[PDB]
């Protein structure tokens, strides 16, 4: 199969390839309960008349709850669902330096503290 190791800071999570297919790659995290866990959908295709390409990356994670610790009967039930999709439209005949600069800019914007505040405190981005 295919294993992906993600470092959160103090622990390491492992995602395993489940549904190996060209037009749809489904990775699922293996920790405990398989239902309501971390899933990742990847897709790659073309467009128009063999001009550019199209890449789609979605990451879902639904929280679960259980009452068997106190209540004497409740199966693990999912609560909410989060969807974080992507869309990559990069042409083939481009520039490696430009692609590297764009990737570095995206990494910097992701690692910056403004997007973290926008996600947590729901404050619009503008510092």
């Amino acid at each position: 199969s295919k294993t992906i190791v993600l470092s959160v800071g103090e622990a390491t999570r492992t995602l395993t390839e489940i549904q190996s297919t060209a037009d749809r790659q489904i990775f699922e995290e293996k920790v405990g309960p398989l239902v309501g866990r971390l899933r990742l959908t990847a897709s790659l295709r073309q467009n128009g008349a063999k001009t550019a390409y199209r890449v789609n990356l979605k990451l879902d994670q639904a929280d679960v709850v259980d009452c068997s610790t106190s209540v004497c009967g409740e199966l693990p039930k999912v609560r909410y669902t989060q969807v974080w999709s992507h869309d990559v439209t990069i042409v083939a005949n481009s520039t490696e330096a430009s692609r590297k600069s764009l990737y570095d800019l995206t990494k910097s914007l992701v690692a910056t503290s403004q997007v973290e505040d926008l996600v947590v405190n729901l404050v619009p981005l503008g510092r």
Partner: protein
Amino acid sequence: HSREVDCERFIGPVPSSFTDPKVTSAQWKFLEDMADMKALADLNKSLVNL
């Protein structure tokens, strides 16, 4: 024999961490900025019912 216990006595002393907390100026400024931002964000939502 038959002994009766009063659980309101057989407990150790209170720890030393039950004191007043210390907050730095940077933490105060950060919390005040966050509070002001959240307050100004809450205002924009009230005018939607115009």
